[PDB]
Structure 1
């Protein structure tokens, strides 16, 4: 599934992500946009064998379990196969798990190099939320 911008914004606000640990909805919208462009199926396998999964590109080394990473922690307790669902609930719960660690949304490098420090509202702008 390739979410619409505010289809995903509404799905994230109905998931309680608005201002979760200090990060307004614009942060999450923009982070998803620049991690996978609103794609739940997206996947990226990086030379160490770990793999970024889902709409938030959660890595398969700390957070999920795919059974083919030699690391390999499963801190969200989840098969990455559930992070590739149409429903974003698994990814949202694991992301609340991650963002509550003290690194914050700096755990997602795309949000850090494109979103962090911007007027992120413009992502939930015109949303009809």
Structure 2
């Protein structure tokens, strides 16, 4: 599924991501934009052989099991395929653990490079939330 901007804002809000660990909803929508362009089926191979999955490009190195990332962990206790669902519940639950891991949203390098410090409220502007 390819979400619209306000449609994803609503789904993230419904799943309790808005102001989770102090990150306003526009931060989460901005990260999703640059990670996946709002596409739940987005996958990208890393140089180290891990893969990033879903709307928030969660990495098999630590967070999910894809059976092909040697030496990796599965800290969200999910198959990486669950992160590709049209239902964002697994991506949200796992993103809450990532953002709680100590470096906040800096875990998403695209959030640090493209969202951090910007007018992230623009991402939810005009949305009925």
Secondary structure of 2:19's counterpart equals coil
Output the CA distance in 1 between the equivalents of 2:56 and 2:50. 15
Shift of 1:101: 1.1
Q: Normalising by structure 1, what TM-score?
A: 0.98
Unaligned 5+ residue runs, structure 2? none
Shift of 1:102: 1.1
CA shift digits 1:98-125 (9 cap, x unpaired): 0011111000011110000011101010
Output the CA distance in 1 between the equivalents of 2:37 and 2:74. 25
Output the CA distance in 2 between the equivalents of 1:68 and 1:81. 13
Shift of 1:71: 2.1
Residue of structure 1 in register with 2:100 after alignment: 100
Shift of 1:48: 1.4
Shift of 1:46: 1.5
CA RMSD of aligned residues (A): 0.6
Unaligned 5+ residue runs, structure 1? none
Secondary structure of 1:3's counterpart equals coil
Output the CA distance in 2 between the equivalents of 1:71 and 1:118. 36
Matched, 1:65 2:83: no
Q: Normalising by structure 2, what TM-score?
A: 0.98
CA shift digits 1:12-41 (9 cap, x unpaired): 011111110110001000000010100000
Question: Which portions of structure 1, spanning 4 or more consecutive aligned residues, are displaced by more than 4 angstroms?
Answer: none
Secondary structure of 2:44's counterpart equals strand
